[PDB]
Symmetry: D5
Subunit: 184 residues, 10 copies
Amino acid sequence: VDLERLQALAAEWLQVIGEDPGREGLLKTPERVAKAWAFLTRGYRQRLEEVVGGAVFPAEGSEMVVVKGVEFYSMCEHHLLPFFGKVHIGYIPDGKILGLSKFARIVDMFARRLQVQERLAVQIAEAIQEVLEPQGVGVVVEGVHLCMMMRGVEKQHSRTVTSAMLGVFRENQKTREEFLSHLR
Amino acid sequence: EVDLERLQALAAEWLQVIGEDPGREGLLKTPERVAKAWAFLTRGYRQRLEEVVGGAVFPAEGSEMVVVKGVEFYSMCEHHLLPFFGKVHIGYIPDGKILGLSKFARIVDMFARRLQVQERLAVQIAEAIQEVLEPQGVGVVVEGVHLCMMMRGVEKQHSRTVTSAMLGVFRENQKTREEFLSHLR
Amino acid sequence: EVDLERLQALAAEWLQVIGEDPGREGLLKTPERVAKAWAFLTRGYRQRLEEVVGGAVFPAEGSEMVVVKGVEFYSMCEHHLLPFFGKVHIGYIPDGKILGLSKFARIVDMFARRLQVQERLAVQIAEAIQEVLEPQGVGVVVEGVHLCMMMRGVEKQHSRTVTSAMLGVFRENQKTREEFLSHLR
Amino acid sequence: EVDLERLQALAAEWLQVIGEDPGREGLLKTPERVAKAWAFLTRGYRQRLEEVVGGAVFPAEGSEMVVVKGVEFYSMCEHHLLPFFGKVHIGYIPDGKILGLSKFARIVDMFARRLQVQERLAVQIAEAIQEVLEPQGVGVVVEGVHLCMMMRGVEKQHSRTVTSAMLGVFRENQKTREEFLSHLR
Amino acid sequence: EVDLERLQALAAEWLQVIGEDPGREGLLKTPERVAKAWAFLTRGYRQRLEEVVGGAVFPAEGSEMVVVKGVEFYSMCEHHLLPFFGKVHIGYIPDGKILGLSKFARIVDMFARRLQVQERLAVQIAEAIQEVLEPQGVGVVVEGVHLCMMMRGVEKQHSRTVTSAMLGVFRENQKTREEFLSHLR
Amino acid sequence: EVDLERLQALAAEWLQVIGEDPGREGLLKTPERVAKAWAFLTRGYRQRLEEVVGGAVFPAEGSEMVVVKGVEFYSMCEHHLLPFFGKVHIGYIPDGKILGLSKFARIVDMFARRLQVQERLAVQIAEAIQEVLEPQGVGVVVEGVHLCMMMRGVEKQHSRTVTSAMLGVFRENQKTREEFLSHLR
Amino acid sequence: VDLERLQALAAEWLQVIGEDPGREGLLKTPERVAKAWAFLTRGYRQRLEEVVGGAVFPAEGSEMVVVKGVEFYSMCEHHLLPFFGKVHIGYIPDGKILGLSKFARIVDMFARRLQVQERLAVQIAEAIQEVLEPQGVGVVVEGVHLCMMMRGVEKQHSRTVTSAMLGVFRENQKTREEFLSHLR
Amino acid sequence: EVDLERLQALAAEWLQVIGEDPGREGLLKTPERVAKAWAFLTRGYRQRLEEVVGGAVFPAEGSEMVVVKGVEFYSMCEHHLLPFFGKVHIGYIPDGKILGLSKFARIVDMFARRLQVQERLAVQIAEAIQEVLEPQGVGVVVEGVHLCMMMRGVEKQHSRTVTSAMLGVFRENQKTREEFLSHLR
Amino acid sequence: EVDLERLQALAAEWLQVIGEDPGREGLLKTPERVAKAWAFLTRGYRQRLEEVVGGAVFPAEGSEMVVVKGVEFYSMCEHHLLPFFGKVHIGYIPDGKILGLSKFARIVDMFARRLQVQERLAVQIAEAIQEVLEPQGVGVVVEGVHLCMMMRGVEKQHSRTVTSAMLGVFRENQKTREEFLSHLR
Amino acid sequence: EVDLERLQALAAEWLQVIGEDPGREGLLKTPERVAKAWAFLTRGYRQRLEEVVGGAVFPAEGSEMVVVKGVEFYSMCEHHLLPFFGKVHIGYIPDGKILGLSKFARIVDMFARRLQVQERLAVQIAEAIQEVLEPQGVGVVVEGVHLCMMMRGVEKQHSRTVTSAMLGVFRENQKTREEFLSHLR
Ligand SMILES: [Zn+2]
Ligand SMILES: [Zn+2]
Ligand SMILES: [Zn+2]
Ligand SMILES: [Zn+2]
Ligand SMILES: [Zn+2]
Ligand SMILES: [Zn+2]
Ligand SMILES: [Zn+2]
Ligand SMILES: [Zn+2]
Ligand SMILES: [Zn+2]
Ligand SMILES: [Zn+2]
């Protein structure tokens, strides 16, 4: 009975900040917020095996596959404010390739949680490593943080880059550079 | 002001309900940070237009339109409590009085740091300026992206919304409104 | 609602007729995926306008035009069953009521996920908004690229098509229409 | 080759199952147009590399790398039968033989106009080039957007995928590969 | 119907007169290739508007303007027999009937694949569309670069030429023409 | 020395064979204009490298690389007699002597105004410069679009071709070539 | 003896804010500041007649002349912090045209003063009106203000547009629009 | 025409007065190169409009506006003898006569290659066009940067100047002028 | 703290000395505003790194480089007391500890809100981060425009200055420094 | 320092020889303006490096490279006396001392306001900085457009020339040089 509990909490939140839950513009707000939050945290209850499904196929070649620009939206665990941007995924197969759409589904699984950008990148990389067991995986996350833009320091031109490199992407300098070069 | 203690408690419980552990290192100080954050995000309700403007009202130097554009803003939609942000463009034709440019930004923040709907935000900003300067006319255009539309639900990514408010000559004089809008292009 | 089992069979036969092997490892689950895909791409016929709006209709805050631009859309041309896509720009002047921004996107998807001609898409979105809000007027601009025109036939690569529908003041008032169009530039 | 009548009937029934009316003025000739479209979209299965090249092979002028970039392509994903498209970048170092520039586009189309996965498309284009000419090396980079990801399922909008294949010196000589890749930036 | 053999002969003599070896390895098949080329580049003379449009003329979904922009074209200037190319933008207001998007591209190619003058090209495309749809009005804009101006003679590099033709309401309604032209910006 | 009269004759017969009226108002002076045109477009064959460079060869001010980029060029492909054009980038490390910037453009035009193959063009320009300055090394990159590929046959639109030639240190010193190529990005 | 007086004031300013006028990086600072300020206020002591010189010529035609993008730098009189941008000048002659370089010299005359952007535009327009007595003059000033960016509100994306229209630019709607259109 | 020897000696002495050494290896042929350069830069004084046009006048194809934009030009300011350059935009409505596109560039150069002031340059180009053809109207817009402002005196860097001339309908018909000006944006 | 009264007095006199009237309406409150402004512009001297960081130090989630870029800054040159501003790019490889992203901005401000020289600014920011996190390495790049170079003296307009500081692995490991710098491109 | 009276006379005679009237109202004061202009454009010969630097040499704050980019420059080619311009990018690694940023611009102007060849300009600026600071190394990159190449002779429009000079570590250390160059991209 979590949605109802969230609704009540949201209703009281509105009052504590000085608003009126009874005015027209806020009537269904506690309910809308509850559903929004169940969706924004749905990643905690997802299972990788189910997320990937039967979309793993035999590798067609040996070269690096790069899936760039997968937009994501997450919530920083420190202030509970959104941070969003793009996730760039690169990998070298070892007999298995993933359906392109599954990369976005994996990204969403870890993004729709309370996060820190440094963690988001490692978890995405590790999930891909588990599913495909590739020669190597590279993940670059680049996002803008509202907890830095609409509050506190209030900087406007800043964006953060975090990444995770596994297998040959970590141990082969040229391989890493080639992946990072594809992103420029 | 805002009962930070109650906000903290509510936030601590919110963490438990969504499935998290309020005890872990990364969330220990979260309720506190969130309470402070929301007090700041709603400080606009507790502001006074006269205090916000201060002593930054000066004599007009001319009768031509003054356009202050690209004033970035950040707000919270009253429908989903998710941020919506962008820029506010202000235009006005003086009547003996002009405002310190930085005060436009302060007025924008006063009405943005509340729970809002973009349509209202433009109107209140325009009305606040009309009250302070009693100009011949005021024009306000708000352009913003909404996370409640990108981060969830419909999940559209390329959309932006434009709202505005036109007072005095900006409403009645087509050429004046058009000139203001052309300046934004 | 749609006979997925029959779509699967049709797709399986389709693969065989074009010269492919339905037994390939890369096509085993294709008829199933195709069936699901097409049920989604045609879900627009099974939707109801009032359920899509869901009561997210609120009182107008001002009299000024609201412009929701860049709403991405994806559709299928009824002529070749090949995708055509781009953006939908919506503008309207309220008469008592405004719509929750995301509902415009939901209205767009409702008519886009059907077999269409871009000319009809612009009309139906505009009419739907007209029915839901009974505004002083509504304007809709659809801009899209057509694959039936680039990956087949003439094979042109730089072309884009603009269609539009104007109701009420967006049709009757030349100045309101131009202002809406200017906002899109 | 392909049974257009079989495809016609399959498409006609496809319209009915998804909930449409084949009798509609706009859908009258659709089953026919679809059959011919799909015959065109799969024509690459029936093409011969020897005829595609048409003996447009000439003696090499030098030993330096030739880069043919931005060859747009259109294909269909074998998993969902939805289009994916973009550009194909080709680079090679001759060994007494160079190919007519336009034949590279003809080779790209030969393999694109089939059911595919982007990883395979790049390999077959490179292998085809290595077969036609006897280059010291070949490099092929494919970059495309996939509608199966954009208009359905995950519905991501900013994503693009890069796949490639390196043969000969492009695989052995690190500097050569980097030089090719740098030319594409 | 064009005499390919006669063209090969003329082309072979052309190569000699300019001081080149027709027996050279990379020129042996040139007269043949040039012959086929020019037959394609002038095929527009041998086309019928009735066949080009086919049966893709459907009922209008609305009365609003339809704008098909960025239709790339390639032609040959009759004065120097050197290529000139760019894009063709078409706008029209239907009267009960609309055309299939792609057919616009075919009409453009029909008049472009001839020896031309840009001023004439814009007129012939507009008249063709007027004859086919008999709409309330048609607007056509052609914008291109001319090699006879940049590759020879004056050798200017940044120049582009705009020519157009306006029929029906696009000529009679000033607002209509402006709205069409604004869509192109 | 080219027989202009013979070209006019051949051009006049060319106009007839394709199904056009040579007596037409806008074609009467065409054979004459085409004759003069082709004499100019092939004048490169009738030029001497010694005269082209003139006496503009001066002592080197330093030992660092000189990069002359963006030298636009226009040529004619020997296979189809259709224009191909773009830019030529030249890089070199002098050995006591440097060339006047503009002379680089003249050398480019000398080899471009002929019937060519892009691979050959890059080689001949590089060899010409090597012969004139006898520097430590020379690097030449040619990038262009080919009308025979976009205006005819495959009709691809986004494609561009890069060909090059490396002499001396630009071939022997990997760092030197990379540095030259990086300047072009 | 103003430069010396400014030097002394600047030296004390350094101390009051917590700095040390004796450290190497500040040694010649009081002197540098004094000269900078004499230059930044030189506009007060300039004479229009001298600024224009003999660069007024007979008009060649009747159409509008538009000199756009004349960069300027000024000091806001409210906080003594810089505001800068561009000045766009448009005018229709009545027998006399000005040397293009003189427009920039006129702009500098009024910019190098303590200003408010609204005033800067009118003074530039009025100066041009006096020198040429044209059928009309139009001046558009667009600048960014540091007193708004590096202090106070601290907004980053904002820029202000001010203008002045005299003669036919004020009274002829089409003429004004044509001028403003040239700036887009 | 021009006395190259007189110019040579003047330039040779100019070098001495500014403090240079005419005996320097780099200045040896300078006085000569300068004389020929200045003869070229002033050649427009000695050109005849009738010969520049070379009878390249053809019967009008339509009544719609022809716009030739981006014709780059280079000139010298009569006040400082420093270069100013940019582009020339030409627009006109025919009256039975149209001009060869390349002749517009030839006319621009005729008046640019003189000592000038930008205001006059536009007027003379328009007057020249009105003389050659008998258009219903002519519009000419010149946009250039002036080195006399950039490398000396005020030393402004972002400035550009626009001058124009309107004759016939471009001066009488407001809409026609606006349409021409809009085409340039 | 800062003696605002003395600053006010000094400012009031400064106004008199430059030639202004401290009595006029626009300057009456100037000394006061300027005093406050400078107290703020120098608040960095009075800050403590430990208080600035607060409790925003958390356990590292990985061993990969974290790059925080585009942090806008505003400072005052100690040479002319004129503003210099731009962006600061920070990169570091953790050793068990990572910082709250917003604290980087706070550290940047702490050292920017003082009289500075850009070379020093980069070093102090880097050192402050090294002290707080004791990372394996730190990289800081500062890019800024200087008004003392644009607003006066040399008056250059297109110049920007790049300074940096590299500590730990960012200084000793070439590949690590290079990777950080590539991320800024 | 320069005989302005003699330059005036030479210029007056120049005007007369090219075919102009020295009596025109637009040329009356031209010889005088030209003389002043040329004294300014050659003032670089009369400047002294130590006076240009003016003791604005300070102690190094760090060991990292300082890169001052985009310093605009204007110069005159000694070959044709026509302007060439663009930008100068400076990079250096200190050894005890750094230079006031604006002095780099003053050093640039000192060598630019002379008759030059771009190759020498890069060398002299680098050597000057080397002498003033005795750094571990200095790198200079000059990028410019040459009017003698665009408004005369070959008349190419897209070309730009890059010259450079590398001293100390910028010459001896491949990695430092690449890092400097990378910063310029
Ligand atoms: Zn946070
Ligand atoms: Zn919302
Ligand atoms: Zn279709
Ligand atoms: Zn798929
Ligand atoms: Zn021609
Ligand atoms: Zn060819
Ligand atoms: Zn201020
Ligand atoms: Zn001048
Ligand atoms: Zn300074
Ligand atoms: Zn020169």
